[PDB]
Structure formats: C-alpha cells, structure tokens
Ligand binder design. Structure first.
Ligand code: 5WH
Ligand code: 5WE
Length: 255
C-alpha cells in the first residue's frame, strides 16, 4: 500500500473506546504526538485481500466531513486501520446524551456537515449505501463526519426508500432518502425511526406512503428539506448539492 503503510512501532495505545462494528477500536498516538483511532480488524470476520477495495476507496476518497484514513498496518495480523480520532464518538450516542442541551442551530450544523460529505461522495459517483447516525462520528469541536463509507435482519430497512425495499434499486436517490432519515435522527435527538414498528411493518407502511413525522425541534422549513428526500418517485428527490443549498438558506434565515 506504499505511503499508506504505517509502521506499527509508531503506535501507542491509550484507551479502548469500545467494540465498534467490525472489531476493537482504541484511542492512541502516532509517533507519540498525533491523536489517532486504531481499529483492529476481527479475524476472518470480514474477508480477503479482494475486500481491501474498501482501502482503495478510503485511500482515494477524502473530504473535511469524511472520517480520514491515515494508514493501515497490513504486514501482520490482526490488521490495524489508523484513522482520524473523533473525540465525541458515535453521532447516535452523542445525540442521545441529554446533557448537551442542543440548540436547533447546532442540529442544523450537524445536518450541513453530513450533507457536505454526501455532496462530495455524490460528486465522486460514490454510493455510501449505509448512511445513518450510527455511521457518523463527532470530533472534539462538535463537527460531524461520515464514516464506514461504502463498507458493505441487519439490513438498514428504516433508512431505505421503497424502490430499494421492493426492487433492490440502489442509486444516489436511495442515499438522498437515507439522508432525510438521518436528518430526522438528528432532530429527534437519536430516536429510532418508526420506533413503534418492526422492520417488516416499516417496509409495508413505507410502501403505503407513511412518512416520519416532523420532530418537535424541526421547523417547518427544516422539515420540508428532510421531507423532500422522501418523494415516492426517486427522480423527484433533490441532489445533495440542492440539499446543501437548502440547508445553507435555512441557516441564513433561521440562524
Ligand atoms: C461504536 C463505538 C465504538 C467505536 C467508536 C469509534 N469507531 C471509530 C472508527 C470508525 C470507523 C473506522 C474505520 O476503519 N472505518 C472503515 C474501515 C474500512 C476498511 F478498513 F475496511 F476498509 C472501510 C470503511 N470504514 C475506524 C474507527 F476507529 C472511531 C474513531 N475514528 N474515533 C473515535 C471513536 N471511534 C465509536 N463508538 C462510540 O463512540 C460509542 C459511544 C461510545
Ligand atoms: C501535519 N500532520 C498532520 C502530518 C504528520 C502526521 C502523520 O504523518 N500521521 C498522523 C497519523 C498517522 C500519520 C499519517 N497521516 C497521513 C495522512 C494522509 C492524508 C491526510 C489528508 O489530509 N489527505 C487529504 N487528501 C485530500 C484532501 S486532504 C492527512 C494525513 C498518512 C498517510 N497517508 N500515510 C501514512 C501515515 N500517515
């Protein structure tokens, strides 16, 4: 992997952050100074060299609102993934911590951060396919970034549009739909979407035009933006560039 190969001698482990999806994650330092997150890949859990297409993705895709890969430790097992350290951890847990007493300006900033990452991915013709608050991380400054980008019952039924559930029709518009659901997760302070329903019931209600209600903290203008991601006809949903312009407009008007 050329310049992406990190010498494991340069890593120092400081704390186990937890068991994320895929393996153990630890907070550590690179060459004793730079903060990093170190993910140990679980043995055989995932798969082969051919799956290290995800590394080809992470080594080529880069944005300020995407969790940045710093390098990998592959000349040894278990494999280490070295990434940007996100001090506030998972966005979903961050939203659920009632001690933050979030203002709606902060919630809209979280949407904007994710929308920027997604506009970038849209521009690179990349499909996240599992966009949700559980796959977003928060740094020490409260900046949200998208992680696990195109990694890849457990299917994300509640973040999927009708055409994905009925026909497996994945497109940039199914990422748009998931983003509206992620804005709803943010404005509901991390509620499970369709929390009264099972996945099978959500899929039937979604096929029948049910839509997530406006969270109390979302204004009618913010709700219009998330609702525009859920047009039954995929071609009627906006692009991330349009969503970003809409969020910027609401921030200028409300903020
Ligand atoms: C979930 C729990 C426990 C774990 C916590 C956690 N995971 C990551 C983290 C997230 C993703 C990756 C990563 O390597 N991603 C990846 C890897 C590939 C692959 F290598 F396969 F190509 C492809 C795509 N994406 C590496 C990471 F260190 C990070 C991170 N960078 N910083 C801080 C915390 N982090 C989040 N949580 C919490 O904060 C909860 C609240 C306590
Ligand atoms: C000054 N300091 C941070 C560097 C000195 C600290 C340092 O070397 N560190 C700190 C953690 C492990 C190690 C490390 N970091 C990187 C890296 C790569 C890309 C970007 C980036 O921003 N890329 C972008 N691409 C497009 C837009 S932005 C930022 C960092 C890399 C790398 N590619 N191979 C090996 C080791 N690497």
């Amino acid at each position: 992997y050329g310049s992406w190969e990190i010498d494991p001698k340069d890593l120092t482990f400081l704390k186990e952050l937890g068991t994320g999806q895929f393996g153990v994650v630890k907070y550590g330092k690179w060459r004793g100074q730079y903060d990093v997150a170190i993910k140990m890949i679980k043995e055989g859990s995932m798969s082969e060299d051919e799956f290290i297409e995800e590394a080809k993705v992470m080594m080529n895709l880069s944005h300020e609102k995407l969790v940045q890969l710093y390098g990998v430790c592959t000349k040894q097992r278990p494999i280490f993934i070295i990434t940007e350290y996100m001090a506030n951890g998972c966005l979903l847990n961050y939203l659920r911590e009632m001690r933050h007493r979030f203002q709606t300006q902060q919630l809209l900033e979280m949407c904007k951060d994710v929308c920027e990452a997604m506009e970038y991915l849209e521009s690179k013709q990349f499909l996240h396919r599992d966009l949700a608050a559980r796959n977003c991380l928060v740094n020490d400054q409260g900046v949200v970034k998208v992680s696990d980008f195109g990694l890849s019952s457990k299917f994300p039924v509640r973040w999927s549009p009708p055409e994905v559930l009925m026909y497996s029709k994945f497109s940039s518009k199914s990422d748009i739909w998931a983003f509206g659901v992620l804005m709803w997760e943010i404005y509901s302070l991390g509620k499970m979407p369709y929390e009264r329903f099972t996945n099978s019931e959500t899929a039937e209600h979604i096929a029948q035009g049910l839509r997530l209600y406006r969270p109390h903290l979302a204004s009618e203008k913010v709700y219009t933006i998330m609702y525009s991601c859920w047009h039954e006809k995929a071609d009627e949903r906006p692009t991330f560039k349009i969503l970003l312009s809409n969020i910027l407009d609401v921030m200028d008007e409300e903020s």
